[PDB]
Amino acid sequence: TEFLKPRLVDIEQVSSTHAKVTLEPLERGFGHTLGNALRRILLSSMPGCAVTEVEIDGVLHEYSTKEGVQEDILEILLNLKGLAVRVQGKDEVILTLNKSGIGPVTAADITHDGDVEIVKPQHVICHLTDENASISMRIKVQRGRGYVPASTRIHSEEDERPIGRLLVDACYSPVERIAYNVEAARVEQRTDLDKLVIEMETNGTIDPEEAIRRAATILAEQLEAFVDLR
Amino acid sequence: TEFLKPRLVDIEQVSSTHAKVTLEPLERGFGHTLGNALRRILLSSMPGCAVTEVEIDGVLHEYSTKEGVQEDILEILLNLKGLAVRVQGKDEVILTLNKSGIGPVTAADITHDGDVEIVKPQHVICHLTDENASISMRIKVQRGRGYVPASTRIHSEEDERPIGRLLVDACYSPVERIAYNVEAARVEQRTDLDKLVIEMETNGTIDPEEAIRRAATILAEQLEAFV
Amino acid sequence: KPLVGTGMERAVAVDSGVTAVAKRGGVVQYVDASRIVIKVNEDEMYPGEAGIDIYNLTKYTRSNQNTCINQMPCVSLGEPVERGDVLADGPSTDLGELAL
Amino acid sequence: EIKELLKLGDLPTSGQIRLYDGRTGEQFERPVTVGYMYMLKLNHLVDDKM
Amino acid sequence: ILSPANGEPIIVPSQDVVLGLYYMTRDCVNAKGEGMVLTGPKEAERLYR
Amino acid sequence: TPEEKLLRAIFGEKASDVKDSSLRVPNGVSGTVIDVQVFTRDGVEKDKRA
């Protein structure tokens, strides 16, 4: 009776988003303790990238319209919140969009640099209807954690930003939903051992080999205040 | 990845077997995670020793009432379950009791091995009414993990016991009732953070604050292959 | 849209005068976020006209209870439209269905 | 008809499922009714009453 | 905590707390481990949890 | 009052007959100015914005 320690044994990709990670082996109690202390951290705080500020030329606020587009500009701001990017080198980038001609404006038409990579290129942003009409915007992407609304950012700034720089609400977390299952492990003599199958579902801006390592680094950091300091 | 860490411990210590710990501040939603990851380990994963099997001469069942004793044969087992025992080196120690005459049997009246310590020796075991009405019992101490009742043992152990061996419920984990709350605490600009209040009562063999460290190192050693 | 309705969501949205309904039927020629130009079908025309109906939607204005009023188009460029359809859903409408 | 429609999309006939808790991770004793209700907002906001 | 109309209390618990107290104090028949004996109330929370 | 008359002789602050009664946003309200309309009477010279 000493212990047995788990290990990251298997990772498979159902789709570009859906993944299923197993851990093996566990004892009796720890199969249902780690499986609930890894859902409560992977949903709350995981670092991702999100769109923060959109600046379309010719337009002052978000409650007007532009010529030759189907949606209002507020619908374009609602479309640009669901954009799954991945910034590797820097910590804040600015992307440009330019389009002219009849047809939709997909997310693949953004002139990206070498580091950022729009992972879902079939996204839909706008709809152009006239030949002479065009669109042009600059899009700021930051790195964050959790959910930061627009009122907090407009309250926690002091420099005068120019009229036209619209603000978007930022939801940073990549993980959409996550479940876990505990099945009887396949060990030949220690029969009552358990395994833990964490079933992750996200968008394409995270790696399931890295998310569990971040979510266990956080848990081994927060328990460091319990192991020595009383 | 900043992740604010608490520095306020403030151990209010009500008794020597009953402490009260507080932690503040934590991130919004980190209260219940640590407060439940420690509850599910202390209750059913802390190792330790307890009385598990007893044998008395003169009885052979859970209902054959012994004679000359004040209490019945069922109230002896509840008194024997609450016996704060620790060992040093071995795993299975057989203990033997001897007391005669008229008077209450107290848990200090037992020949001890050199490695076996008994924490609260003023514990009452029985009560003897008659003079020259003695008592003797073979007490078996084991080493296990958590709580195991008498149902799952005799349900699966198809092997026949030596007749007279009563099965006592075991309490291997050396902590008694643990409960916890989460209250809201604030920093000078943020207000959704939270404090955690860990209340712990226990028997002997363990300092009530040291059990929290002994469970936290078990949980921290479990995540070695992930960082 | 409401998942469980009573089928009366269709009549209340049209008759309330809050959507933009087509008088004549035809093919949609041009869709903006402000205007909708519809080319009339041949048999539904009058013999001294040019055969284009222009609907001008009303963008963000003020109601009496200080809430929004905003008409978005719901048709796409180059698709047929019959008589009495719903071309622009108003504040609480959704493809011609009332949706509060 | 509701039970004949729930069996089309592989759902429980009783309409109640076995929910797990969020905080503690245990599951409740009884099954719990879970579905969809069309929720409205109302004009009695709290910014105009305080 | 006492009404001036009559000596009955006025901090009588309402619907949800009284449903919890009614559900906590009941008894089934098999009920997953009846008939066992316990030491105190502090080893009955450890069994339930 | 005489002590304020002393203060406005110690320093040279002399506020004119002008007096501020401007229009301010009522409290606990954020927003965005999306429309400005200016009406003026006949025979009154308009501003630059009007």
XYZ file of C-alpha atoms in Angstrom:
706
model
C 0.000 0.000 0.000
C 2.201 2.845 -1.262
C 0.349 4.387 -4.289
C 0.016 4.261 -8.069
C 0.409 7.354 -10.223
C -1.440 8.250 -13.444
C 0.055 9.282 -16.775
C -1.111 10.925 -20.005
C -1.485 7.699 -21.970
C -3.728 8.253 -25.014
C -4.866 11.200 -27.147
C -7.032 10.884 -30.253
C -8.648 13.434 -32.567
C -12.300 12.850 -33.409
C -12.399 16.011 -35.528
C -10.474 19.275 -35.740
C -12.225 20.319 -32.500
C -13.554 17.208 -30.751
C -10.936 15.270 -28.769
C -10.940 12.464 -26.202
C -8.099 12.062 -23.690
C -7.680 9.139 -21.283
C -5.648 8.859 -18.080
C -4.527 5.535 -16.618
C -4.157 4.214 -13.968
C -5.903 5.711 -10.957
C -6.951 4.414 -7.568
C -10.569 4.310 -6.409
C -11.132 7.794 -4.999
C -8.880 9.854 -7.259
C -10.718 8.845 -10.426
C -13.644 11.067 -9.475
C -11.692 13.843 -7.727
C -9.306 14.717 -10.555
C -12.157 14.325 -13.037
C -14.073 17.113 -11.311
C -11.083 19.298 -10.473
C -10.132 19.257 -14.159
C -13.554 20.302 -15.412
C -13.807 23.223 -12.985
C -10.523 24.692 -14.252
C -10.719 23.919 -17.996
C -14.006 25.831 -18.264
C -13.051 28.878 -16.216
C -9.513 30.015 -17.053
C -7.651 28.916 -20.183
C -5.613 31.403 -22.265
C -6.993 32.050 -25.736
C -7.107 34.762 -28.371
C -10.115 36.889 -29.241
C -11.144 39.946 -31.233
C -11.287 43.169 -29.219
C -11.470 46.296 -31.407
C -12.852 46.690 -34.929
C -12.302 49.873 -36.949
C -14.238 50.126 -40.226
C -13.492 53.265 -42.212
C -16.236 55.741 -43.023
C -18.401 54.656 -40.073
C -18.579 56.559 -36.782
C -20.544 54.338 -34.386
C -22.043 50.847 -34.340
C -25.696 51.924 -34.696
C -25.559 52.995 -38.354
C -25.303 51.269 -41.711
C -22.924 51.202 -44.648
C -23.873 51.107 -48.311
C -23.726 47.916 -50.328
C -23.711 45.468 -47.416
C -26.607 43.324 -46.280
C -26.119 43.418 -42.530
C -25.957 46.317 -40.142
C -22.526 47.032 -38.713
C -23.766 45.703 -35.357
C -24.395 42.356 -37.032
C -20.821 42.493 -38.337
C -19.628 43.042 -34.767
C -21.735 40.077 -33.660
C -20.179 38.006 -36.450
C -16.618 39.029 -35.585
C -16.880 37.811 -31.993
C -17.052 34.212 -33.175
C -13.660 34.164 -34.889
C -11.130 31.514 -33.891
C -7.568 32.776 -34.314
C -4.252 31.577 -32.909
C -1.434 34.024 -32.122
C 1.906 32.299 -31.535
C 4.832 34.707 -31.340
C 3.535 38.101 -30.244
C 0.869 38.981 -27.689
C -1.245 41.414 -29.750
C -1.648 41.677 -33.523
C -3.605 43.816 -35.988
C -5.158 42.163 -39.043
C -6.459 43.857 -42.180
C -9.431 42.912 -44.345
C -9.980 44.156 -47.893
C -12.711 43.025 -50.264
C -14.525 44.401 -53.301
C -17.085 42.670 -55.489
C -20.409 40.851 -55.262
C -20.324 37.879 -52.919
C -19.856 37.014 -49.251
C -16.856 38.087 -47.207
C -15.443 34.928 -45.684
C -12.866 34.890 -42.910
C -10.265 33.433 -45.286
C -9.937 36.825 -47.029
C -7.925 38.364 -44.171
C -4.325 39.147 -45.128
C -2.657 37.290 -42.278
C 0.973 37.337 -41.186
C 3.197 34.311 -40.645
C 2.291 33.798 -36.993
C -1.500 34.170 -36.860
C -3.602 31.431 -38.456
C -7.383 31.644 -38.785
C -8.294 28.060 -37.993
C -11.840 28.096 -39.379
C -11.643 29.696 -42.842
C -15.266 28.995 -43.810
C -16.655 31.591 -41.374
C -19.022 34.255 -42.717
C -18.582 37.929 -41.833
C -20.519 40.004 -44.358
C -22.465 40.011 -47.616
C -21.575 42.370 -50.447
C -24.293 43.161 -52.965
C -23.059 45.975 -55.227
C -20.144 45.981 -57.647
C -18.864 49.447 -56.719
C -19.207 48.771 -52.985
C -16.219 47.682 -50.914
C -15.188 47.210 -47.290
C -11.980 47.686 -45.307
C -11.311 47.231 -41.606
C -8.506 46.691 -39.127
C -9.035 44.084 -36.429
C -7.138 43.876 -33.139
C -6.602 40.485 -31.486
C -5.351 40.191 -27.910
C -4.602 37.367 -25.480
C -6.715 36.993 -22.387
C -8.399 34.802 -19.804
C -12.045 34.552 -18.825
C -14.667 37.057 -19.942
C -13.952 40.797 -20.066
C -16.958 42.963 -21.024
C -16.851 46.274 -22.860
C -17.897 48.451 -19.903
C -14.884 47.285 -17.875
C -12.460 48.205 -20.658
C -14.052 51.589 -21.359
C -14.034 52.281 -17.604
C -10.408 51.194 -17.043
C -8.822 53.433 -19.709
C -7.796 57.087 -19.605
C -6.266 58.130 -22.940
C -8.563 59.630 -25.564
C -9.166 57.082 -28.273
C -10.355 58.463 -31.633
C -13.976 58.395 -32.731
C -14.523 55.294 -34.826
C -12.607 52.662 -32.874
C -15.503 50.405 -31.942
C -15.200 48.051 -28.984
C -16.277 44.411 -29.060
C -16.990 42.250 -26.039
C -14.229 39.677 -25.671
C -14.762 36.051 -24.716
C -11.293 34.573 -24.441
C -11.743 30.965 -23.361
C -11.356 28.310 -26.078
C -13.166 25.422 -24.382
C -16.872 25.253 -25.230
C -17.996 22.248 -23.178
C -16.332 19.270 -21.533
C -17.443 15.959 -20.011
C -15.639 13.076 -18.345
C -16.320 9.375 -17.825
C -14.789 6.932 -15.340
C -14.536 3.316 -16.485
C -12.932 0.233 -14.978
C -9.272 0.113 -15.971
C -7.707 -2.918 -17.647
C -5.062 -4.006 -15.135
C -4.321 -7.711 -14.740
C -3.925 -8.012 -10.953
C -4.880 -4.683 -9.391
C -8.431 -5.196 -10.609
C -10.283 -2.249 -9.026
C -8.189 0.469 -10.695
C -9.973 3.193 -12.655
C -9.306 5.172 -15.814
C -10.570 8.658 -16.629
C -11.730 9.603 -20.121
C -11.914 13.393 -20.390
C -14.047 14.274 -23.426
C -13.078 17.757 -24.597
C -14.817 19.993 -27.131
C -13.446 23.374 -28.169
C -12.656 25.428 -31.221
C -9.436 25.002 -33.145
C -7.318 27.374 -31.032
C -6.097 24.933 -28.360
C -4.190 21.653 -28.148
C -5.542 18.881 -25.863
C -2.014 17.750 -25.000
C -1.383 21.290 -23.691
C -4.716 22.124 -22.049
C -4.472 19.359 -19.451
C -0.887 20.385 -18.712
C -1.989 23.974 -18.086
C -4.980 22.812 -16.016
C -2.706 20.641 -13.881
C 0.041 23.267 -13.600
C -2.595 25.585 -12.120
C -3.814 22.890 -9.725
C -0.285 22.013 -8.598
C 0.418 25.715 -8.079
C -2.686 26.408 -5.982
C -1.994 23.403 -3.741
C 1.545 24.681 -3.127
C 0.083 27.044 -0.518
C -1.297 24.039 1.402
C 1.700 21.699 1.427
C 4.286 23.789 3.324
C 2.639 26.949 4.694
C 0.397 25.308 7.294
C -1.117 33.447 -16.368
C -0.877 35.497 -13.165
C -3.256 33.556 -10.873
C -3.447 35.341 -7.485
C -2.263 33.207 -4.534
C -3.406 33.555 -0.907
C -1.302 34.873 1.950
C -3.614 34.918 4.986
C -3.773 31.668 6.964
C -4.946 32.710 10.467
C -5.386 29.296 12.095
C -7.978 29.691 14.816
C -7.451 26.646 17.029
C -10.523 25.839 19.120
C -9.132 22.682 20.735
C -6.157 20.376 20.355
C -8.240 17.977 18.233
C -10.407 20.565 16.431
C -8.941 23.371 14.307
C -10.396 25.996 11.974
C -8.450 27.243 8.958
C -9.170 30.113 6.586
C -7.666 31.021 3.215
C -8.119 34.308 1.381
C -8.254 35.438 -1.350
C -8.775 32.952 -4.185
C -9.965 33.346 -7.758
C -13.691 33.271 -8.493
C -14.501 29.574 -8.570
C -11.329 28.276 -6.915
C -13.035 27.897 -3.561
C -15.105 24.801 -4.198
C -12.380 23.147 -6.292
C -9.821 22.998 -3.486
C -12.513 22.641 -0.828
C -13.862 19.514 -2.523
C -10.567 18.081 -3.733
C -9.463 17.998 -0.090
C -12.749 16.638 1.267
C -12.792 13.644 -1.080
C -9.202 12.746 -0.122
C -9.312 13.175 3.657
C -12.515 11.153 4.028
C -11.603 8.130 1.923
C -7.908 8.163 1.033
C -6.002 8.987 4.230
C -4.111 5.901 5.458
C -4.020 4.887 9.085
C -4.719 2.183 11.624
C -7.808 1.079 13.540
C -9.342 -1.898 15.297
C -11.087 -4.125 12.780
C -11.600 -7.635 14.196
C -12.269 -8.645 17.790
C -12.826 -11.996 19.495
C -14.341 -12.484 22.955
C -14.463 -15.811 24.778
C -17.960 -16.765 25.900
C -19.818 -15.239 22.943
C -19.916 -16.316 19.321
C -22.393 -13.948 17.612
C -23.550 -10.338 17.398
C -26.478 -11.016 19.743
C -25.362 -13.626 22.315
C -25.319 -11.332 25.344
C -22.411 -11.944 27.715
C -23.022 -12.341 31.436
C -21.777 -10.173 34.274
C -21.196 -7.220 31.938
C -23.298 -4.084 32.269
C -23.728 -3.287 28.574
C -24.775 -5.775 25.915
C -22.446 -7.262 23.311
C -23.404 -4.676 20.673
C -22.460 -1.598 22.709
C -18.915 -2.931 23.163
C -18.229 -2.648 19.432
C -19.224 1.029 19.249
C -16.846 1.694 22.139
C -14.113 -0.287 20.398
C -14.534 1.538 17.080
C -13.692 4.877 18.686
C -10.228 3.744 19.794
C -7.442 6.138 18.768
C -4.627 3.714 17.943
C -1.366 4.345 16.111
C 1.487 1.970 15.309
C 5.168 2.453 14.466
C 6.544 -0.361 12.314
C 4.230 -3.324 11.808
C 0.925 -3.730 9.963
C -1.124 -6.350 11.860
C -0.836 -6.306 15.658
C -2.912 -8.605 17.859
C -3.807 -7.051 21.213
C -5.039 -8.835 24.331
C -7.064 -7.457 27.236
C -7.277 -8.722 30.819
C -9.304 -7.207 33.655
C -11.081 -8.916 36.548
C -13.180 -7.883 39.523
C -15.966 -5.314 39.571
C -15.329 -2.035 37.781
C -15.309 -0.235 34.428
C -12.803 -1.485 31.868
C -10.706 1.477 30.737
C -8.557 1.387 27.582
C -5.281 1.897 29.487
C -5.601 -1.606 30.997
C -3.942 -3.507 28.135
C -0.450 -4.934 27.642
C 1.133 -3.037 24.756
C 3.757 -3.948 22.209
C 6.831 -1.731 22.063
C 5.765 -0.122 18.774
C 2.033 0.288 19.496
C 0.843 3.516 21.116
C -2.646 4.352 22.391
C -3.511 8.032 22.316
C -6.415 8.507 24.739
C -5.952 5.952 27.545
C -8.945 7.158 29.598
C -11.378 5.663 27.071
C -14.062 3.445 28.579
C -14.616 0.046 26.957
C -17.047 -1.797 29.237
C -18.478 -1.865 32.756
C -18.321 -4.865 35.094
C -20.992 -5.386 37.753
C -20.197 -8.600 39.634
C -17.059 -9.414 41.581
C -14.864 -12.112 39.988
C -16.583 -11.513 36.634
C -13.572 -11.059 34.376
C -13.205 -10.252 30.683
C -10.675 -10.995 27.950
C -10.637 -10.151 24.261
C -8.308 -10.514 21.284
C -8.114 -7.176 19.454
C -6.692 -7.108 15.920
C -5.320 -3.820 14.560
C -4.724 -3.462 10.820
C -3.475 -0.804 8.411
C -5.776 0.354 5.642
C -7.146 3.325 3.722
C -10.476 5.055 4.237
C -13.703 3.574 5.597
C -14.820 -0.020 5.129
C -18.034 -1.304 6.745
C -18.953 -4.827 7.829
C -21.283 -5.405 4.864
C -18.792 -5.475 1.978
C -16.438 -7.739 3.935
C -18.809 -10.560 4.911
C -20.718 -10.212 1.625
C -17.690 -11.191 -0.481
C -15.610 -13.237 1.980
C -17.080 -16.669 1.245
C -14.380 -18.261 3.428
C -15.621 -19.420 6.819
C -14.402 -17.493 9.837
C -13.083 -19.047 13.045
C -16.280 -19.139 15.066
C -16.445 -16.329 17.610
C -14.649 -13.731 15.473
C -16.815 -10.617 15.411
C -16.354 -8.171 12.543
C -15.945 -4.584 13.745
C -16.493 -1.634 11.426
C -13.192 0.021 10.540
C -12.189 3.694 10.480
C -8.724 3.719 8.928
C -8.695 7.426 8.080
C -7.595 9.423 11.147
C -9.844 12.430 10.465
C -13.354 12.852 11.830
C -15.966 15.243 10.338
C -14.646 17.853 7.901
C -16.880 20.606 6.529
C -16.194 23.795 4.630
C -17.815 27.008 3.442
C -16.956 29.628 0.831
C -17.507 33.297 1.659
C -16.893 36.331 -0.524
C -13.725 38.333 0.124
C -12.527 41.443 -1.670
C -9.319 43.125 -2.822
C -9.193 46.909 -3.326
C -10.591 46.991 -6.874
C -11.932 43.495 -7.588
C -14.902 42.149 -5.677
C -15.892 38.710 -7.026
C -13.113 36.803 -5.257
C -13.727 34.415 -2.396
C -12.370 33.057 0.866
C -12.391 29.444 2.022
C -13.025 28.227 5.582
C -11.851 24.683 6.346
C -13.141 23.236 9.624
C -11.642 19.970 10.844
C -12.287 17.810 13.889
C -10.304 14.628 14.420
C -9.256 12.003 16.934
C -5.663 11.676 18.111
C -2.580 10.337 16.236
C -2.574 13.427 13.964
C -2.226 17.180 14.447
C -5.469 18.632 12.954
C -3.544 21.052 10.736
C -1.005 18.409 9.697
C -3.720 16.278 8.086
C -4.334 19.080 5.580
C -0.664 18.998 4.578
C -0.713 15.199 4.471
C -3.645 15.267 2.046
C -2.252 18.142 -0.011
C 1.021 16.300 -0.595
C -0.950 13.223 -1.706
C -2.873 15.326 -4.214
C 0.241 17.214 -5.345
C 2.277 14.040 -5.837
C -0.532 12.624 -7.994
C 0.001 15.274 -10.709
C 3.684 14.601 -11.375
C 3.356 13.386 -14.978
C 1.353 16.426 -16.123
C 3.490 19.480 -15.348
C -38.226 31.902 -33.155
C -40.316 30.133 -30.506
C -39.960 26.370 -30.603
C -43.486 25.739 -29.285
C -45.999 28.119 -30.841
C -49.686 28.028 -31.670
C -49.566 28.872 -35.377
C -50.939 32.354 -34.615
C -47.432 33.829 -34.741
C -47.753 34.272 -38.505
C -50.907 36.405 -38.547
C -49.911 38.844 -35.797
C -46.573 39.779 -37.370
C -48.021 40.565 -40.807
C -51.176 42.466 -39.823
C -49.458 44.644 -37.204
C -47.867 46.846 -39.868
C -44.370 46.408 -38.442
C -42.900 44.378 -41.329
C -42.413 45.219 -45.000
C -44.734 43.157 -47.203
C -44.613 42.999 -50.989
C -47.546 44.490 -52.878
C -46.667 42.843 -56.195
C -44.696 39.674 -56.832
C -41.431 39.179 -58.657
C -37.668 38.820 -58.381
C -35.480 40.788 -55.977
C -33.076 43.001 -57.904
C -30.961 44.650 -55.194
C -30.699 44.237 -51.418
C -29.096 46.788 -49.131
C -29.366 47.257 -45.385
C -31.587 50.293 -46.031
C -33.480 49.722 -49.287
C -34.867 46.765 -51.235
C -35.533 46.998 -54.982
C -37.927 44.419 -56.432
C -38.581 43.804 -60.129
C -42.272 43.154 -60.744
C -43.419 40.077 -62.653
C -44.909 40.616 -66.090
C -48.591 39.798 -65.572
C -48.772 41.777 -62.301
C -47.942 45.091 -63.985
C -50.030 48.081 -65.026
C -49.876 49.368 -68.624
C -48.410 52.809 -67.884
C -45.714 51.983 -65.333
C -42.017 51.160 -65.203
C -42.452 48.130 -62.949
C -40.090 48.698 -60.016
C -41.232 48.929 -56.407
C -38.777 50.485 -53.962
C -39.106 49.749 -50.254
C -37.166 52.004 -47.895
C -36.642 50.347 -44.528
C -36.482 52.475 -41.386
C -33.297 52.061 -39.353
C -32.623 52.861 -35.681
C -35.342 55.168 -34.366
C -37.127 55.831 -31.080
C -40.350 54.233 -29.885
C -42.692 55.622 -27.252
C -41.331 53.305 -24.544
C -37.752 54.336 -25.489
C -36.867 51.021 -27.131
C -35.388 50.291 -30.538
C -37.110 49.955 -33.912
C -35.001 48.434 -36.671
C -35.938 46.589 -39.865
C -33.437 44.155 -41.286
C -33.931 42.491 -44.685
C -34.431 38.743 -44.803
C -34.211 37.957 -48.521
C -31.053 37.433 -50.547
C -29.920 38.841 -53.869
C -31.710 37.315 -56.843
C -34.535 35.137 -55.524
C -38.241 35.043 -56.415
C -40.830 36.634 -54.145
C -44.580 36.038 -54.367
C -47.394 38.339 -53.270
C -47.859 38.983 -49.579
C -44.520 37.635 -48.402
C -42.408 39.175 -45.649
C -39.369 41.023 -46.985
C -38.094 42.776 -43.844
C -38.478 41.527 -40.292
C -38.989 44.313 -37.785
C -38.070 44.484 -34.095
C -39.439 41.198 -32.713
C -40.077 39.295 -35.935
C -38.206 36.373 -37.472
C -38.937 35.241 -41.071
C -42.415 36.667 -40.608
C -42.993 34.904 -37.280
C -43.622 36.877 -34.111
C -40.760 36.233 -31.703
C -40.743 38.169 -28.447
C -47.717 12.497 -29.069
C -44.974 14.029 -26.916
C -43.765 10.550 -25.981
C -44.020 9.468 -29.620
C -41.901 12.485 -30.582
C -39.306 12.093 -27.828
C -38.566 8.541 -28.994
C -37.633 9.849 -32.447
C -34.581 11.791 -31.305
C -33.310 9.252 -28.733
C -34.514 10.991 -25.580
C -35.949 9.610 -22.322
C -39.705 9.092 -22.368
C -40.219 10.459 -18.851
C -38.568 13.746 -19.816
C -36.359 13.762 -16.708
C -32.627 13.063 -16.893
C -29.937 12.369 -14.276
C -28.181 15.673 -13.670
C -24.763 15.917 -12.074
C -23.882 18.713 -9.704
C -21.514 21.459 -10.719
C -19.723 22.246 -7.483
C -19.267 18.902 -5.738
C -19.446 16.596 -8.760
C -21.899 14.142 -7.218
C -25.179 13.269 -8.903
C -28.617 13.940 -7.462
C -30.860 11.161 -6.163
C -33.963 11.703 -8.262
C -34.080 12.469 -11.970
C -34.599 16.139 -12.790
C -36.873 17.661 -15.445
C -34.808 19.389 -18.150
C -36.057 20.971 -21.354
C -36.734 24.272 -23.120
C -38.966 27.152 -22.056
C -39.491 30.326 -24.083
C -38.295 32.987 -21.625
C -39.199 36.636 -22.155
C -37.635 39.784 -20.816
C -39.769 42.555 -19.362
C -39.736 46.341 -19.340
C -39.338 46.623 -15.549
C -35.561 46.813 -15.627
C -33.625 47.568 -12.458
C -31.689 50.531 -13.877
C -34.896 52.583 -13.981
C -36.093 51.632 -10.487
C -33.012 52.299 -8.344
C -38.973 36.738 16.284
C -42.410 36.643 17.936
C -45.531 38.144 16.423
C -47.444 40.737 18.475
C -50.722 39.197 17.303
C -50.077 35.904 19.101
C -47.228 34.073 20.778
C -46.458 31.959 17.704
C -43.138 32.690 15.961
C -42.918 34.814 12.826
C -39.536 33.511 11.615
C -41.182 30.187 10.822
C -39.315 28.691 7.834
C -40.870 28.964 4.388
C -41.293 26.532 1.508
C -37.839 25.455 0.293
C -36.141 25.018 3.660
C -39.131 23.097 5.014
C -39.042 20.818 1.957
C -35.361 20.190 2.656
C -36.025 19.404 6.311
C -38.886 17.101 5.323
C -36.725 15.238 2.822
C -33.838 14.903 5.266
C -35.985 13.234 7.951
C -37.665 10.240 6.295
C -37.044 6.513 6.001
C -37.003 3.999 3.167
C -36.897 0.211 3.625
C -33.730 -1.120 1.991
C -32.046 2.283 1.676
C -28.432 1.115 0.977
C -27.071 -0.056 4.283
C -29.679 0.010 7.001
C -29.349 -1.869 10.266
C -25.752 -0.813 10.881
C -24.720 0.733 14.190
C -22.876 4.033 14.543
C -20.959 5.868 17.246
C -22.125 9.462 16.962
C -23.632 12.003 14.591
C -20.157 12.962 13.388
C -19.673 9.496 11.873
C -23.048 9.751 10.139
C -21.983 12.682 7.982
C -18.821 10.787 7.038
C -20.985 7.866 5.929
C -23.368 10.026 3.913
C -20.678 12.081 2.182
C -20.797 88.024 1.679
C -17.855 90.026 3.091
C -15.298 87.227 3.495
C -15.706 86.197 -0.143
C -15.294 89.890 -0.975
C -12.002 89.666 0.925
C -10.988 86.528 -1.004
C -11.700 88.195 -4.344
C -9.432 91.076 -3.315
C -6.610 88.822 -2.115
C -6.618 87.108 -5.515
C -7.769 88.548 -8.806
C -10.544 86.074 -9.575
C -13.617 87.969 -10.832
C -16.209 85.652 -12.368
C -18.419 87.467 -14.857
C -22.215 87.621 -15.168
C -21.980 84.344 -17.106
C -23.401 81.278 -15.365
C -23.337 77.621 -16.381
C -26.673 75.843 -16.804
C -25.669 73.390 -19.522
C -27.176 70.014 -20.429
C -25.526 66.973 -18.861
C -26.141 63.245 -19.221
C -28.165 61.928 -16.252
C -26.190 59.768 -13.880
C -25.733 56.028 -14.208
C -26.069 56.165 -18.009
C -23.571 55.232 -20.698
C -24.279 55.528 -24.390
C -23.327 56.922 -27.775
C -24.608 60.071 -29.485
C -26.162 58.779 -32.715
C -28.269 61.774 -33.803
C -28.258 65.535 -33.199
C -31.054 67.788 -34.476
C -30.957 71.589 -34.286
C -34.017 73.797 -34.694
C -33.729 77.579 -34.740
C -36.123 80.517 -34.836
C -36.534 82.798 -37.840
C -34.267 85.820 -37.926
C -31.590 84.200 -35.749
C -28.115 83.597 -37.162
C -27.259 79.904 -37.249
C -24.114 78.334 -35.815
C -21.489 76.383 -37.728
C -23.005 73.026 -36.761
C -26.535 74.144 -37.639
